[PDB]
Amino acid sequence: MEQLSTANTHFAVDLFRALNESDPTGNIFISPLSISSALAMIFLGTRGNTAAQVSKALYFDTVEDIHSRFQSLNADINKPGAPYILKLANRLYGEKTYNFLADFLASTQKMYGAELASVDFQQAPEDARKEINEWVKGQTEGKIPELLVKGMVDNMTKLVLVNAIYFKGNWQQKFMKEATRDAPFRLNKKDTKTVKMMYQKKKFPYNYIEDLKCRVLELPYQGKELSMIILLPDDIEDESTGLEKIEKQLTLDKLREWTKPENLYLAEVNVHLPRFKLEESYDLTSHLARLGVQDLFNRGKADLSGMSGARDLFVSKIIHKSFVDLNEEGTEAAAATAGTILLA
Amino acid sequence: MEQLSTANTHFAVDLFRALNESDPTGNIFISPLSISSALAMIFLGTRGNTAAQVSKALYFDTVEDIHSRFQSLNADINKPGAPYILKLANRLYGEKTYNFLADFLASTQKMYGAELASVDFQQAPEDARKEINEWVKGQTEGKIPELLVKGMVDNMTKLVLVNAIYFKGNWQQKFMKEATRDAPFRLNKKDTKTVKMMYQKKKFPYNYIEDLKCRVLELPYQGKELSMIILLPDDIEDESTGLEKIEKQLTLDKLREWTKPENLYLAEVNVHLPRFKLEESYDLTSHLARLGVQDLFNRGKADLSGMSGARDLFVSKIIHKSFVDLNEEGTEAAAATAGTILLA
Amino acid sequence: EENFNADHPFIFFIRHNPSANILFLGRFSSP
Amino acid sequence: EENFNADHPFIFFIRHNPSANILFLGRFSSP
Ligand SMILES: [Ca+2]
Ligand SMILES: [Ca+2]
């Protein structure tokens, strides 16, 4: 999993940096793995400079046997019998009347577990939209009920590639509801808003990053196969959120050094953490173009002939929706990414 | 299951009659359900007079919601947790570089459980042949190890549709090996060959068909969800096998009246049955053409535009291989049918 | 007591009893 | 005894520990 996780994490960091450039102070919440999965399925059908752009920006070109490694990753993430709910699912919706290459379809099905659903984009794009949305809603236990809004698909849509990811796990160490009190959350040096602050003191993997004046905490979920990692500046010491120096030097390399299990030590920690819930929506198309994924979205330049043998398709939009609810018991998190492919 | 089983049984009777016309005295062994399954998947992609011919000869036109009923039938046949092994599997092998219609592929996958395997017919038809054969061999527990021999696929093959069926069940009432003795089997009024004749006396569903001078016996397998039904003339009373009058009046209607559970009664029966094993091979193409399936096999007339949107494909061959081993413990039976689709 | 001595050619089939579908169908006439 | 009082903006992510893959990644900065 070595090469693939490094690649996926490098992309995660690049995409967070791009989103931060558009919004340096608001809440941000994404599933990087969900986005990398949708783009890995698209990459199967791309050729030429379109493919080269996708593999460079997504770091797929740094992974030997990329699609085989993803296949193994999906098998592990979806393993049955775990003490938490974790689902990562892929699906293809194709226009009924459209012809796809056999090898493209066989590979997305074998490597990504994506089965092909045949829908009527040409005569009934609304029914098709609602079918896609119902599937994502079902995969995310209702948390992403309308991934694609009116106008996202029309009678010219030929293919929609969809990834949904869902997680619900209890904390290894739960907070007691009775210790949760109203407390002030400082947005910056002088605005304050009241939050429900949860409290517990327990031994957790921990570190203070001396040179960044930042604390790192790991909060295991039940089973310890997933953890939440939190990076918290010692104080708000800049003219916005307090995170500016961390975000400034966020790299694959530093993120790894800060949060590596080997670099955390068990400490008895007083944890105050707000109870919170985020629902976010992104049109990733322009952010991805800024990252170097250009021909893919360009009607005249896109090479998707791996999907139908001709340069007649392009990707109009990649959209991402996400959800997280963090409380005393644990965390329920969901996301879904759709890439819409239209006739060029 | 009412309409579909009647249809499938009517076809079974028609195809047995056709095979009997080519060989009125040899052993015959087929899986009618296997052949009907391969043709039901082909029928999904046929249009025009090609479709009309297939549905008439296979009786699919007498079944409302034919493919949905087959989907239900496959679910029941393959149900987990049964006290016998019964597998009915479907698969599609498509040329890597060929483009298929989305709706055709989605339907064969949803209704028949056939997944699409992408193979290299164009550059490496031998590897593709061996891949198909290995899959069928695996599905039939080694009993059909080479469904397609050299020359059955070439670099012009675009699609091979495959059904395999496998059954192994113990008798509800097993024969004791120690009671099995050599005894003479009469092929006709004066040739004889020695067989291992098994013996037991037990209560079995039974009937003597008065007007045909024929006995009917039902031998349940363990669980009683499958039975073997045997129709035995009272003696060899014609100038060949003894079965001529039965075969003469074999119809869906008579077969039903002779072997219906309602028409059998429990009787204490002395059963002498040979231990035997058959392996048969059929090129069904001409028999099916004789049955009325003509355009499908004709390069100029075949309409398979449901598979790729164009009239560029036709079926060159439908071949069927089968196997049965009947002994004291039970029966192991296997069959597989491949329809090879080439460029017209 | 009945006698079913199959020492001459017969037709046989394996039926899926719930659906009544014939899974396999044959004639044994040549050992 | 350490203190981790998250009453000002922080970055958080959910990691799949066996593979080290980041499944979800966020910044909480505006209640
Ligand atoms: Ca559910
Ligand atoms: Ca096996």
Swiss-Prot record, chains C, D:
Residue ranges for the region (CARD-binding motif (CBM)) are: 3-31
Q: Write out the PTM section of this UniProt entry.
A: The N-terminus is blocked.
Localization: Secreted; Cytoplasm; Cytolytic granule; Early endosome
**Assembly description:** Monomer. Interacts (via C-terminus) with CASP1; CASP4 (via CARD domain) and CASP5; these interactions regulate the activity of inflammatory caspases. Interacts with PRTN3. Interacts with GZMH. Interacts with TMSB4.
Which family would the database say this protein is a member of?
Belongs to the serpin family. Ov-serpin subfamily.
Query: What is this protein's function per UniProt?
Result: Neutrophil serine protease inhibitor that plays an essential role in the regulation of the innate immune response, inflammation and cellular homeostasis. Acts primarily to protect the cell from proteases released in the cytoplasm during stress or infection. These proteases are important in killing microbes but when released from granules, these potent enzymes also destroy host proteins and contribute to mortality. Regulates the activity of the neutrophil proteases elastase, cathepsin G, proteinase-3, chymase, chymotrypsin, and kallikrein-3.
Protein name in the entry: Leukocyte elastase inhibitor
Q: What is the lineage of its organism?
A: Eukaryota, Metazoa, Chordata, Craniata, Vertebrata
Gene coding for it = SERPINB1
Q: Which residues of the full protein are shown?
A: 349 to 379 of 379
